[PDB]
Fold:
Amino acid sequence: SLRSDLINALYDENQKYDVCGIISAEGKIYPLGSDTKVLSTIFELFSRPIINKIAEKHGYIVEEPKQQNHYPDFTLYKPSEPNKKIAIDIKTTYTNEKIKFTLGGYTSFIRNNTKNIVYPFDQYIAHWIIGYVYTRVSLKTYNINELNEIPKPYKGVKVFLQDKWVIAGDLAGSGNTTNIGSIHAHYKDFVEGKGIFDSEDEFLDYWRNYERTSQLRNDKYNNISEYRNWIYRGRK
Amino acid sequence: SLRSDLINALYDENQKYDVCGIISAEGKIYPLGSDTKVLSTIFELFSRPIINKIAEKHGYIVEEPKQQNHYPDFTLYKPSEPNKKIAIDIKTTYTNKENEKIKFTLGGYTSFIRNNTKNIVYPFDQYIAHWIIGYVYTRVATKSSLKTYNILNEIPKPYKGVKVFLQDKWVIAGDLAGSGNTTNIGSIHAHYKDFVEGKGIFDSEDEFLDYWRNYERTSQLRNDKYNNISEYRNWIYRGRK
DNA sequence: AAGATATCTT
DNA sequence: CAAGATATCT
Ligand SMILES: [Mg+2]
Ligand SMILES: [Mg+2]
Ligand SMILES: [Mg+2]
Ligand SMILES: [Mg+2]
Structure:
Protein backbone atom coordinates (compact mmCIF):
# COMPACT_ATOMS: atom_id res chain seq x y z
CA SER A 1 0.00 0.00 0.00
CA LEU A 2 0.97 3.68 0.07
CA ARG A 3 1.85 3.17 3.73
CA SER A 4 3.78 -0.07 3.38
CA ASP A 5 5.59 1.29 0.31
CA LEU A 6 6.47 4.53 2.12
CA ILE A 7 7.76 2.82 5.27
CA ASN A 8 9.72 0.47 2.98
CA ALA A 9 11.28 3.31 1.00
CA LEU A 10 12.03 5.04 4.30
CA TYR A 11 13.92 2.11 5.80
CA ASP A 12 15.89 1.74 2.56
CA GLU A 13 16.92 5.33 2.02
CA ASN A 14 18.02 5.37 5.68
CA GLN A 15 20.12 2.21 5.40
CA LYS A 16 21.74 3.28 2.17
CA TYR A 17 22.73 6.94 2.76
CA ASP A 18 24.29 9.37 5.26
CA VAL A 19 23.88 13.12 5.03
CA CYS A 20 27.27 14.66 5.97
CA GLY A 21 27.22 18.27 4.89
CA ILE A 22 25.77 21.17 3.03
CA ILE A 23 27.28 21.81 -0.42
CA SER A 24 27.55 25.09 -2.39
CA ALA A 25 27.09 25.55 -6.17
CA GLU A 26 30.88 25.73 -6.44
CA GLY A 27 31.65 22.42 -4.73
CA LYS A 28 32.65 23.61 -1.23
CA ILE A 29 31.13 21.56 1.64
CA TYR A 30 30.31 22.70 5.21
CA PRO A 31 29.97 20.14 8.06
CA LEU A 32 26.71 19.40 9.94
CA GLY A 33 26.20 20.09 13.62
CA SER A 34 25.20 17.48 16.18
CA ASP A 35 21.95 18.91 17.62
CA THR A 36 18.22 18.45 16.89
CA LYS A 37 17.63 21.89 15.32
CA VAL A 38 20.04 20.84 12.56
CA LEU A 39 19.14 17.17 12.24
CA SER A 40 15.38 17.77 12.18
CA THR A 41 15.70 20.07 9.19
CA ILE A 42 18.13 17.65 7.50
CA PHE A 43 15.92 14.56 8.21
CA GLU A 44 12.91 16.28 6.75
CA LEU A 45 14.74 17.26 3.58
CA PHE A 46 16.24 13.80 3.25
CA SER A 47 12.65 12.39 3.39
CA ARG A 48 11.11 14.75 0.81
CA PRO A 49 12.30 12.98 -2.39
CA ILE A 50 11.23 9.55 -1.09
CA ILE A 51 7.77 10.83 0.00
CA ASN A 52 7.17 12.49 -3.40
CA LYS A 53 8.33 9.35 -5.23
CA ILE A 54 5.94 6.89 -3.56
CA ALA A 55 3.08 9.40 -3.44
CA GLU A 56 3.20 9.67 -7.25
CA LYS A 57 3.49 5.86 -7.67
CA HIS A 58 0.14 5.78 -5.88
CA GLY A 59 -1.43 8.79 -7.60
CA TYR A 60 -1.33 11.18 -4.64
CA ILE A 61 -0.30 14.81 -4.99
CA VAL A 62 2.14 16.09 -2.35
CA GLU A 63 1.58 19.58 -0.86
CA GLU A 64 3.81 21.24 1.73
CA PRO A 65 2.75 24.29 3.70
CA LYS A 66 2.93 27.62 1.83
CA GLN A 67 2.86 29.41 5.21
CA GLN A 68 5.23 28.63 8.08
CA ASN A 69 2.75 28.33 10.96
CA HIS A 70 1.15 25.23 9.52
CA TYR A 71 0.93 21.52 10.19
CA PRO A 72 1.65 19.02 8.48
CA ASP A 73 4.97 18.82 6.64
CA PHE A 74 3.27 16.97 3.76
CA THR A 75 -0.40 16.70 2.72
CA LEU A 76 -1.16 13.81 0.34
CA TYR A 77 -4.52 13.36 -1.43
CA LYS A 78 -6.02 12.19 -4.74
CA PRO A 79 -7.64 14.99 -6.78
CA SER A 80 -10.73 12.81 -7.16
CA GLU A 81 -10.75 12.33 -3.37
CA PRO A 82 -9.99 15.70 -1.65
CA ASN A 83 -11.69 14.72 1.62
CA LYS A 84 -9.49 11.67 1.95
CA LYS A 85 -6.27 13.60 2.73
CA ILE A 86 -3.31 12.06 4.56
CA ALA A 87 -1.12 14.15 6.95
CA ILE A 88 2.49 13.08 7.06
CA ASP A 89 4.62 14.93 9.63
CA ILE A 90 8.36 14.58 10.39
CA LYS A 91 9.59 14.54 14.02
CA THR A 92 13.02 14.06 15.48
CA THR A 93 14.46 13.41 18.90
CA TYR A 94 17.69 11.93 20.18
CA THR A 95 19.23 9.39 22.52
CA ASN A 96 22.62 9.30 24.28
CA GLU A 97 17.16 4.40 26.48
CA LYS A 98 13.54 5.56 26.11
CA ILE A 99 12.53 8.41 23.81
CA LYS A 100 9.72 10.91 23.66
CA PHE A 101 8.44 13.25 20.92
CA THR A 102 6.41 16.42 21.07
CA LEU A 103 3.36 15.68 18.89
CA GLY A 104 2.03 19.00 17.86
CA GLY A 105 -0.05 21.37 19.86
CA TYR A 106 -3.25 20.55 21.65
CA THR A 107 -4.96 23.91 21.19
CA SER A 108 -4.54 24.50 17.43
CA PHE A 109 -6.10 22.46 14.58
CA ILE A 110 -7.35 19.81 17.06
CA ARG A 111 -9.58 22.33 18.84
CA ASN A 112 -10.16 24.53 15.81
CA ASN A 113 -10.83 22.93 12.40
CA THR A 114 -8.99 25.59 10.38
CA LYS A 115 -6.29 26.69 12.83
CA ASN A 116 -2.61 26.31 11.85
CA ILE A 117 -3.25 23.54 9.34
CA VAL A 118 -2.81 23.54 5.59
CA TYR A 119 -6.31 22.16 4.94
CA PRO A 120 -9.18 21.90 7.42
CA PHE A 121 -8.67 19.09 9.97
CA ASP A 122 -11.85 17.23 8.93
CA GLN A 123 -10.41 16.72 5.47
CA TYR A 124 -7.71 14.41 6.77
CA ILE A 125 -8.53 10.73 7.36
CA ALA A 126 -5.09 9.86 8.66
CA HIS A 127 -2.26 11.57 10.57
CA TRP A 128 1.06 9.79 10.24
CA ILE A 129 4.38 10.55 11.83
CA ILE A 130 7.76 9.68 10.41
CA GLY A 131 9.91 9.67 13.53
CA TYR A 132 13.68 9.89 13.31
CA VAL A 133 15.71 8.90 16.33
CA TYR A 134 19.43 9.54 16.26
CA THR A 135 22.19 8.73 18.75
CA ARG A 136 24.04 11.99 19.47
CA VAL A 137 27.80 11.90 18.83
CA SER A 138 33.95 20.20 12.31
CA LEU A 139 34.67 23.93 12.09
CA LYS A 140 36.25 23.70 8.62
CA THR A 141 35.21 23.22 4.96
CA TYR A 142 35.77 20.35 2.53
CA ASN A 143 35.59 19.44 -1.16
CA ILE A 144 34.01 16.58 -3.15
CA ASN A 145 37.27 14.69 -2.99
CA GLU A 146 37.07 14.68 0.82
CA LEU A 147 33.52 13.29 1.45
CA ASN A 148 34.74 10.51 3.71
CA GLU A 149 36.76 12.89 5.94
CA ILE A 150 33.69 14.90 7.04
CA PRO A 151 32.58 13.88 10.55
CA LYS A 152 28.97 12.71 10.63
CA PRO A 153 26.62 14.34 13.11
CA TYR A 154 25.30 11.05 14.51
CA LYS A 155 26.33 7.56 15.67
CA GLY A 156 23.29 5.94 14.06
CA VAL A 157 19.76 6.85 12.94
CA LYS A 158 16.50 4.86 13.02
CA VAL A 159 13.19 5.78 11.41
CA PHE A 160 9.61 4.60 11.87
CA LEU A 161 6.24 5.58 10.45
CA GLN A 162 3.31 5.49 12.87
CA ASP A 163 -0.17 6.95 13.36
CA LYS A 164 -0.09 9.96 15.68
CA TRP A 165 -2.91 8.87 18.07
CA VAL A 166 -1.27 5.49 18.44
CA ILE A 167 1.96 6.86 19.95
CA ALA A 168 0.34 9.65 21.98
CA GLY A 169 0.75 9.90 25.78
CA ASP A 170 -1.38 11.59 28.48
CA LEU A 171 1.26 14.07 29.64
CA ALA A 172 2.02 17.30 27.73
CA GLY A 173 5.20 17.35 25.64
CA SER A 174 5.77 21.04 26.39
CA GLY A 175 4.30 23.73 28.65
CA ASN A 176 4.06 27.23 27.12
CA THR A 177 3.73 25.79 23.62
CA THR A 178 1.06 23.29 24.78
CA ASN A 179 2.12 20.19 22.78
CA ILE A 180 0.68 16.69 23.09
CA GLY A 181 3.33 14.47 24.54
CA SER A 182 4.15 11.05 22.99
CA ILE A 183 4.57 7.92 25.14
CA HIS A 184 7.95 7.74 26.80
CA ALA A 185 9.08 4.42 25.40
CA HIS A 186 11.81 2.50 23.64
CA TYR A 187 11.83 2.78 19.87
CA LYS A 188 10.23 -0.74 19.80
CA ASP A 189 7.05 0.53 21.31
CA PHE A 190 6.83 3.24 18.60
CA VAL A 191 7.30 0.82 15.74
CA GLU A 192 4.84 -1.62 17.36
CA GLY A 193 2.22 0.99 18.30
CA LYS A 194 2.07 0.14 21.97
CA GLY A 195 0.17 3.20 23.11
CA ILE A 196 -2.12 3.99 26.02
CA PHE A 197 -5.18 5.32 24.17
CA ASP A 198 -7.95 2.80 23.41
CA SER A 199 -8.85 4.52 20.16
CA GLU A 200 -8.18 7.65 18.09
CA ASP A 201 -11.53 8.99 19.35
CA GLU A 202 -10.28 8.65 22.94
CA PHE A 203 -6.95 10.33 22.03
CA LEU A 204 -8.74 13.25 20.50
CA ASP A 205 -11.26 13.83 23.30
CA TYR A 206 -8.43 13.67 25.83
CA TRP A 207 -6.28 16.36 24.19
CA ARG A 208 -9.27 18.47 23.26
CA ASN A 209 -10.14 18.70 26.99
CA TYR A 210 -6.68 18.69 28.66
CA GLU A 211 -6.39 21.90 30.81
CA ARG A 212 -3.26 24.00 30.07
CA THR A 213 -1.81 24.02 33.58
CA SER A 214 -1.80 21.87 36.73
CA GLN A 215 -4.02 24.32 38.60
CA LEU A 216 -6.89 23.66 36.24
CA ARG A 217 -5.98 20.03 35.67
CA ASN A 218 -6.02 19.21 39.37
CA ASP A 219 -9.76 19.54 39.37
CA LYS A 220 -10.43 17.80 36.00
CA TYR A 221 -7.74 15.35 34.92
CA ASN A 222 -3.97 15.08 34.68
CA ASN A 223 -3.67 11.57 33.22
CA ILE A 224 -5.62 8.81 31.39
CA SER A 225 -7.17 7.35 34.58
CA GLU A 226 -8.43 10.69 35.79
CA TYR A 227 -9.84 11.37 32.33
CA ARG A 228 -11.74 8.05 32.26
CA ASN A 229 -13.09 8.95 35.74
CA TRP A 230 -13.97 12.45 34.44
CA ILE A 231 -15.91 10.72 31.64
CA TYR A 232 -17.77 8.58 34.15
CA ARG A 233 -18.77 11.65 36.19
CA GLY A 234 -20.46 13.03 33.09
CA ARG A 235 -17.56 15.18 31.85
CA LYS A 236 -17.30 17.19 35.02
CA SER B 1 39.73 44.48 14.55
CA LEU B 2 38.37 40.98 14.95
CA ARG B 3 35.13 42.77 14.16
CA SER B 4 36.30 44.40 10.91
CA ASP B 5 37.97 41.17 9.77
CA LEU B 6 34.83 39.17 10.66
CA ILE B 7 32.41 41.33 8.82
CA ASN B 8 34.65 41.52 5.72
CA ALA B 9 34.94 37.69 5.56
CA LEU B 10 31.18 37.15 6.18
CA TYR B 11 30.44 39.78 3.53
CA ASP B 12 32.91 38.35 1.06
CA GLU B 13 31.87 34.73 1.48
CA ASN B 14 28.23 35.87 1.11
CA GLN B 15 28.99 37.45 -2.26
CA LYS B 16 30.92 34.42 -3.56
CA TYR B 17 29.09 31.21 -2.53
CA ASP B 18 25.56 29.82 -2.62
CA VAL B 19 24.56 26.85 -0.58
CA CYS B 20 22.30 24.58 -2.63
CA GLY B 21 21.89 21.27 -0.94
CA ILE B 22 22.72 18.64 1.61
CA ILE B 23 25.13 16.09 0.21
CA SER B 24 25.46 12.50 1.42
CA ALA B 25 28.69 10.53 2.10
CA GLU B 26 27.93 8.64 -1.10
CA GLY B 27 27.50 11.84 -3.13
CA LYS B 28 23.74 12.11 -3.38
CA ILE B 29 22.39 15.66 -3.13
CA TYR B 30 19.13 16.69 -1.50
CA PRO B 31 17.78 20.21 -2.44
CA LEU B 32 17.10 22.66 0.36
CA GLY B 33 13.84 24.05 1.65
CA SER B 34 12.78 27.69 1.50
CA ASP B 35 11.48 28.38 5.04
CA THR B 36 13.38 29.98 7.89
CA LYS B 37 13.78 26.83 9.93
CA VAL B 38 15.89 25.36 7.14
CA LEU B 39 17.71 28.59 6.12
CA SER B 40 18.69 29.68 9.65
CA THR B 41 20.24 26.20 10.05
CA ILE B 42 22.08 26.62 6.73
CA PHE B 43 23.24 30.19 7.46
CA GLU B 44 24.64 29.27 10.85
CA LEU B 45 26.56 26.31 9.46
CA PHE B 46 27.83 28.44 6.58
CA SER B 47 28.96 31.07 9.13
CA ARG B 48 30.84 28.70 11.50
CA PRO B 49 34.03 28.16 9.38
CA ILE B 50 34.38 31.92 8.80
CA ILE B 51 33.86 32.84 12.48
CA ASN B 52 36.42 30.19 13.42
CA LYS B 53 38.96 31.28 10.81
CA ILE B 54 38.91 34.96 11.70
CA ALA B 55 38.79 34.16 15.43
CA GLU B 56 41.93 32.07 15.35
CA LYS B 57 43.67 34.79 13.32
CA HIS B 58 43.16 37.04 16.37
CA GLY B 59 44.05 34.39 18.92
CA TYR B 60 40.44 33.81 20.12
CA ILE B 61 38.97 30.39 20.92
CA VAL B 62 35.45 29.66 19.73
CA GLU B 63 33.02 27.69 21.92
CA GLU B 64 29.53 26.63 20.88
CA PRO B 65 26.86 25.61 23.37
CA LYS B 66 26.92 22.10 24.88
CA GLN B 67 23.23 21.84 25.79
CA GLN B 68 20.44 22.97 23.40
CA ASN B 69 18.73 25.64 25.44
CA HIS B 70 21.79 27.86 25.74
CA TYR B 71 22.76 31.24 24.22
CA PRO B 72 24.88 32.26 22.23
CA ASP B 73 25.82 30.35 19.06
CA PHE B 74 29.49 31.21 19.43
CA THR B 75 31.41 32.39 22.49
CA LEU B 76 34.84 33.87 21.54
CA TYR B 77 37.62 34.44 24.08
CA LYS B 78 41.32 34.89 24.53
CA PRO B 79 42.82 32.87 27.41
CA SER B 80 44.36 36.21 28.51
CA GLU B 81 40.96 37.87 28.81
CA PRO B 82 38.41 35.48 30.42
CA ASN B 83 36.15 38.34 31.52
CA LYS B 84 36.21 39.83 28.07
CA LYS B 85 34.12 37.25 26.25
CA ILE B 86 32.40 38.10 22.95
CA ALA B 87 28.97 36.54 22.27
CA ILE B 88 28.27 36.16 18.54
CA ASP B 89 24.68 35.09 17.78
CA ILE B 90 23.20 34.26 14.37
CA LYS B 91 19.69 35.48 13.52
CA THR B 92 17.74 35.09 10.28
CA THR B 93 14.42 36.33 8.89
CA TYR B 94 12.99 36.69 5.41
CA THR B 95 11.29 39.22 3.20
CA ASN B 96 8.66 38.50 0.57
CA LYS B 97 10.18 41.10 -1.65
CA GLU B 98 13.66 42.56 -1.82
CA ASN B 99 14.17 45.80 0.17
CA GLU B 100 11.19 45.38 2.54
CA LYS B 101 11.22 46.18 6.31
CA ILE B 102 12.53 43.35 8.46
CA LYS B 103 12.59 42.39 12.14
CA PHE B 104 14.35 39.79 14.31
CA THR B 105 13.63 38.11 17.67
CA LEU B 106 16.73 38.99 19.77
CA GLY B 107 16.65 36.29 22.44
CA GLY B 108 14.63 36.23 25.59
CA TYR B 109 14.40 39.10 28.05
CA THR B 110 13.80 36.81 31.05
CA SER B 111 16.73 34.38 31.06
CA PHE B 112 20.39 35.55 31.23
CA ILE B 113 19.51 39.22 30.99
CA ARG B 114 17.59 38.91 34.31
CA ASN B 115 19.58 36.04 35.78
CA ASN B 116 23.34 36.00 35.36
CA THR B 117 23.84 32.27 34.60
CA LYS B 118 20.43 31.15 33.30
CA ASN B 119 20.38 29.65 29.77
CA ILE B 120 23.80 31.02 28.82
CA VAL B 121 27.11 29.28 28.11
CA TYR B 122 29.03 31.54 30.45
CA PRO B 123 27.76 33.89 33.21
CA PHE B 124 26.33 37.02 31.55
CA ASP B 125 28.82 39.35 33.20
CA GLN B 126 31.84 37.60 31.56
CA TYR B 127 30.96 39.00 28.13
CA ILE B 128 31.81 42.59 27.11
CA ALA B 129 30.13 42.25 23.72
CA HIS B 130 26.95 40.78 22.23
CA TRP B 131 26.95 40.70 18.44
CA ILE B 132 24.23 39.67 16.02
CA ILE B 133 25.25 38.25 12.62
CA GLY B 134 21.88 38.91 10.91
CA TYR B 135 20.90 37.21 7.63
CA VAL B 136 18.02 38.36 5.45
CA TYR B 137 16.79 36.37 2.41
CA THR B 138 14.03 36.81 -0.14
CA ARG B 139 11.73 33.80 -0.10
CA VAL B 140 11.39 31.88 -3.38
CA ALA B 141 8.51 29.52 -4.17
CA THR B 142 9.51 25.83 -4.01
CA LYS B 143 9.55 20.82 -9.40
CA SER B 144 13.22 20.05 -9.69
CA SER B 145 13.39 20.69 -5.91
CA LEU B 146 11.66 17.31 -5.37
CA LYS B 147 14.29 14.98 -6.71
CA THR B 148 17.95 14.29 -5.88
CA TYR B 149 20.98 15.40 -7.91
CA ASN B 150 24.44 14.04 -8.64
CA ILE B 151 27.57 16.22 -8.28
CA LEU B 152 25.31 21.84 -7.75
CA ASN B 153 24.66 24.38 -10.54
CA GLU B 154 21.42 22.62 -11.71
CA ILE B 155 19.78 22.61 -8.29
CA PRO B 156 17.25 25.40 -7.67
CA LYS B 157 18.34 27.63 -4.74
CA PRO B 158 15.59 28.28 -2.20
CA TYR B 159 16.29 32.03 -2.04
CA LYS B 160 16.83 35.02 -4.38
CA GLY B 161 19.49 37.11 -2.63
CA VAL B 162 21.08 36.81 0.80
CA LYS B 163 22.11 39.87 2.83
CA VAL B 164 24.33 39.79 5.94
CA PHE B 165 25.25 42.25 8.72
CA LEU B 166 27.18 42.26 12.00
CA GLN B 167 25.98 44.50 14.81
CA ASP B 168 25.71 44.85 18.59
CA LYS B 169 22.46 43.48 19.96
CA TRP B 170 21.77 46.58 22.05
CA VAL B 171 22.19 48.73 18.96
CA ILE B 172 19.50 47.06 16.87
CA ALA B 173 17.19 46.44 19.79
CA GLY B 174 13.59 47.73 19.56
CA ASP B 175 11.05 48.49 22.30
CA LEU B 176 8.37 45.90 21.49
CA ALA B 177 8.59 42.19 22.29
CA GLY B 178 9.67 39.83 19.53
CA SER B 179 7.39 37.06 20.80
CA GLY B 180 4.62 36.57 23.36
CA ASN B 181 4.74 33.20 25.08
CA THR B 182 8.51 32.94 24.60
CA THR B 183 9.22 36.49 25.84
CA ASN B 184 11.80 37.60 23.28
CA ILE B 185 13.29 41.02 22.83
CA GLY B 186 12.18 42.46 19.48
CA SER B 187 14.55 44.33 17.21
CA ILE B 188 13.80 47.55 15.37
CA HIS B 189 11.51 46.89 12.40
CA ALA B 190 13.33 48.65 9.58
CA HIS B 191 15.31 48.21 6.38
CA TYR B 192 18.61 46.35 6.21
CA LYS B 193 20.71 49.54 5.86
CA ASP B 194 19.18 50.55 9.21
CA PHE B 195 20.62 47.48 10.91
CA VAL B 196 24.06 47.93 9.19
CA GLU B 197 24.05 51.57 10.26
CA GLY B 198 22.92 51.01 13.85
CA LYS B 199 19.86 53.22 13.55
CA GLY B 200 18.11 51.83 16.68
CA ILE B 201 16.10 53.29 19.53
CA PHE B 202 18.11 53.08 22.78
CA ASP B 203 20.75 55.65 23.79
CA SER B 204 23.07 53.33 25.60
CA GLU B 205 23.56 49.69 26.23
CA ASP B 206 22.48 50.29 29.86
CA GLU B 207 19.21 51.84 28.78
CA PHE B 208 18.78 48.76 26.57
CA LEU B 209 19.35 46.47 29.54
CA ASP B 210 17.18 48.45 32.00
CA TYR B 211 14.31 48.65 29.59
CA TRP B 212 14.23 44.91 28.89
CA ARG B 213 14.98 43.87 32.46
CA ASN B 214 11.86 45.74 33.58
CA TYR B 215 9.55 45.10 30.65
CA GLU B 216 6.41 43.33 31.97
CA ARG B 217 5.16 40.15 30.20
CA THR B 218 1.71 41.21 29.03
CA SER B 219 -0.04 44.28 27.55
CA GLN B 220 -2.24 44.19 30.68
CA LEU B 221 0.63 44.83 33.01
CA ARG B 222 2.66 47.01 30.62
CA ASN B 223 -0.33 49.37 30.46
CA ASP B 224 0.33 50.44 34.03
CA LYS B 225 4.12 50.63 33.65
CA TYR B 226 5.45 51.12 30.12
CA ASN B 227 4.87 49.62 26.66
CA ASN B 228 7.35 51.61 24.56
CA ILE B 229 10.53 53.69 24.95
CA SER B 230 8.59 56.93 25.38
CA GLU B 231 6.60 55.55 28.27
CA TYR B 232 9.70 54.07 29.88
CA ARG B 233 11.59 57.38 29.82
CA ASN B 234 8.58 59.12 31.45
CA TRP B 235 8.52 56.24 34.00
CA ILE B 236 12.32 56.77 34.49
CA TYR B 237 11.71 60.52 34.87
CA ARG B 238 9.13 60.01 37.65
CA GLY B 239 11.38 57.84 39.77
CA ARG B 240 10.46 54.38 38.30
CA LYS B 241 6.74 54.42 39.09
C1' DA C 1 4.94 20.73 35.08
C1' DA C 2 6.69 25.14 33.37
C1' DG C 3 9.34 27.84 30.70
C1' DA C 4 13.58 28.14 27.99
C1' DT C 5 16.01 27.26 22.88
C1' DA C 6 14.55 30.75 17.28
C1' DT C 7 11.05 32.94 14.43
C1' DC C 8 6.57 33.66 12.41
C1' DT C 9 1.56 34.83 11.92
C1' DT C 10 -3.08 37.02 12.39
C1' DC D 1 0.95 44.50 18.06
C1' DA D 2 -0.68 41.57 20.90
C1' DA D 3 -0.57 36.76 21.67
C1' DG D 4 -0.18 32.44 20.56
C1' DA D 5 1.42 29.32 17.01
C1' DT D 6 5.25 26.77 14.32
C1' DA D 7 9.71 22.17 16.71
C1' DT D 8 12.12 20.53 20.68
C1' DC D 9 14.62 20.86 24.63
C1' DT D 10 15.79 21.33 29.83
MG1 LIG E 1 8.07 21.03 6.69
MG1 LIG F 1 8.04 18.20 11.14
MG1 LIG G 1 24.30 27.30 17.36
MG1 LIG H 1 21.14 31.54 16.75
